[PDB]
From Swiss-Prot:
Note: JQ1, a thieno-triazolo-1,4-diazepine derivative, and I-BET, a benzodiazepine derivative, have been tested on tumors with success. Treatment with GSK1210151A (I-BET151, a I-BET derivative) has strong effets on mixed lineage leukemia and promotes myeloid differentiation and leukemia stem-cell depletion.
Gene responsible for this protein: BRD4
Annotated phenotype, changing Y83C: In CDLS6; likely pathogenic; reduced acetylated histone binding
Organismal lineage: Eukaryota, Metazoa, Chordata, Craniata, Vertebrata
Positions of the Bromo domain: 1-110
Family the entry assigns: Belongs to the BET family.
Tissue-specificity statement: Ubiquitously expressed.
Protein species of origin: Homo sapiens
Protein name from the UniProt record: Bromodomain-containing protein 4
Record-annotated site: Acetylated histone binding: N86
C-alpha cells in the first residue's frame, strides 16, 4: 500500500525533473558528470559518490529503492555533489538550487500512509 504509493510518487517526481518545463536548469543533472569532456581533473578527488538523474532513473526501474527515503537520499546526494564541487556563485549552482526547489516542494507532498 504505502511503499508502492511512495515509489509511484518518486517516479512522478523524477519524470517531472526530466520534463521540458524544467529543462533549462535541469539538463546538467540528466547524465553522469563527464569528467574527461569537461576537463574536471579534480572531480574524482573531491566527489566520492557521483550521482545523476539517469542513474536514479535506472535504480527506480530496477526496483533498487525500497522506499522514498532511499530515493530522496540519492537525489540530495546529486545536489550535494554539485554544491561541494562548484563555487557557490557558479551558474550550475543557481540551476541546482532551482531544481532542488522543484524536487523538495513535491517530495514534501509524499504520501505518508
Ligand atoms: C559546472 O558544472 C557542470 C557543468 C556541466 C555538467 C555537469 C556539471 C556539474 C558539476 C561539475 N557538478 O554538478 C554538475 C551538475 N554537464 C555538462 N554538459 C555539458 C555539455 N556542458 C556543461 C557545461 C559546460 C560549461 N559551462 C557550463 C555552465 C553551466 C552548466 C553547464 C556547463 C556541463
Amino acid at each position: 500500500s504505502k511503499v508502492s504509493e511512495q515509489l509511484k510518487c518518486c517516479s512522478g517526481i523524477l519524470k517531472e525533473m526530466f520534463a521540458k518545463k524544467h529543462a533549462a536548469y535541469a539538463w546538467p543533472f540528466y547524465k553522469p558528470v563527464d569528467v574527461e569532456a569537461l576537463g574536471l581533473h579534480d572531480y574524482c578527488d573531491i566527489i566520492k559518490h557521483p550521482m545523476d538523474m539517469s542513474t536514479i532513473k535506472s535504480k527506480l526501474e530496477a526496483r533498487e529503492y525500497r522506499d522514498a527515503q532511499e530515493f530522496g537520499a540519492d537525489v540530495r546526494l546529486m545536489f550535494s555533489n554539485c554544491y561541494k564541487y562548484n563555487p557557490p556563485d557558479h551558474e550550475v549552482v543557481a540551476m541546482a538550487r532551482k531544481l532542488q526547489d522543484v524536487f523538495e516542494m513535491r517530495f514534501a507532498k509524499m504520501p505518508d500512509e
